[PDB]
């Protein structure tokens, strides 16, 4: 189930999956049917994947709790209305379906996807094992990044793969891509936040579907930290007090070094750590942000 | 197989489909395998891509050469491996149409590990044959400017206003497109279409050039649309469709314009005329 550092804010649930169920380990709901993830197949005529005509969001489940399911459905449905996608289901129906996908999977730790496409409009929901852009150890102890020399954004998951390969060839774990106008764009599968003089900044691109950075901004807010979506300059990145990766697939990752240069002392920054540890604490704290899945 | 108007330039091949083939009526090719259309499914996890749309009419596939050139050119951008060559995709494409037994077919090539999907299904109409011949009604939406979100909203406003279709403007008050088509206007024996996955428009411009009609890709203003002599829709799914009225007011004499009719009748004749553009399909 992936090992996590002992005594760390990151711990998997302790429990037994009954694999006699064909649903164990991954459930996808397609066309009114809950089916094992392995057998979940979508028509080639779905003009969503065929012609990028879809809305989607990604959620997560941790310790049997699904995080901010309501906010995810509002965001998915908002997107549905802008694209004139009528799912045919209500918010409550989509909620019960998402929760049943997780329940039938038996996963206490799960990566969840909700998609609405133009098929007659189609809804696809899946719950599969929890996904890491960075392993648990790196979430705790921090990772290493470079700015690619051989790929920029404009001011394409191909760029992101190349950026990642170049990082690994230069002996770092990940890339922070810049754009044409020398502003921070993003990482392969994450957004970047910088901390400078107790303020937090993240690019305005908002490519990622998830709600993790919104949670980071709200956590920063409740910590008295000014947090802003805006253009982040090359200068701001290389002069940042802290840099962090933010994504649904692993949460908040300290970035210890950029182009082999330590950021602060070359260890996770104090604001990165406070936000990260709060994020994981939220997964066990009764309140509006979580619902327990019934297994 | 969809009725067409009697005596019109639009007539389906006359033939019976052998449904003893599981491939009859529509076929998909997915990474090595030919499948009945209905069986053409991919993993949800598999669900960055380029694609082109083409058509077959009277057993002839239209401009597959130029479609494949367009498709591969697109593949190098987005860093997507072709996996196969042009001659190979060409064979696979003609084989899908052949196996489908469809003389009239809508065909799609997509490149998205690399995945290549090809299919041939029954021919798709943006506008029914009756409107391809007798023309249709349009409005400029007041609540949507220039995403199938916009074009679906345009379409909803058009129907709400009693019209068959919408012609969207951009924030610059220039003509963008309709839902599923490019707009061409005729003014003073000149053809114009807005400077914005089908070779149907390029085909209209080459037909227009060959009739001694200037044709320009440029900015068309709202005022040029309302003042046009003729308005037509252009798309792979149905070809060239006259627009007889705009905001309830007839364009011209309230019937298909003569350039529209000339270009339209020439496009349908291209399918039946042997040459570089059309290749007969071995069924």
Residue numbers in the entry:
A (entry chain A): 19 to 137, 151 to 186, 198 to 337
B (entry chain B): 19 to 65, 71 to 135, 151 to 184, 198 to 247, 251 to 337
Please share text taken word for word from the publication where this structure appeared.
In this study, we focus on the ω-transaminase from Mycobacterium vanbaalenii (MvTA) which exhibits activity toward d-fructose rather than fructose 6-phosphate. The transaminase MvTA demonstrates transaminate activity toward d-fructose 1, and the resulting 2-amino-2-deoxy-mannitol (ADM) 2 undergoes dehydrogenation under the enzyme GutB1 and spontaneously cyclizes to produce the valuable azasugar mannojirimycin (MJ), which serves as a precursor for 1-DNJ. The dimeric enzyme exhibited the characteristic structural architecture of class IV PLP-dependent enzymes, consisting of two subunits. The interface between the two subunits constituted the binding pocket for the amino donor and acceptor.
A mutant M9 with significantly enhanced activity and thermostability has been successfully obtained and crystallized for structural resolution. The obtained mutant M9, incorporating nine mutation sites, exhibited a remarkable 16.4-fold increase in specific activity and an impressive 208-fold improvement in thermostability compared to WT. In all three structures, the asymmetric unit comprised two polypeptide chains forming a homodimer. Moreover, the mutation of K142P notably heightened the rigidity of the loop region (137–146). In both the first and second half-reactions, the RMSF values for the loop region (102–108) and its adjacent α-helices in M9 were notably lower compared to WT. These findings indicated that the proline substitution at position 105 could enhance the rigidity of the loop region, consequently reducing the flexibility of its neighboring α-helices.
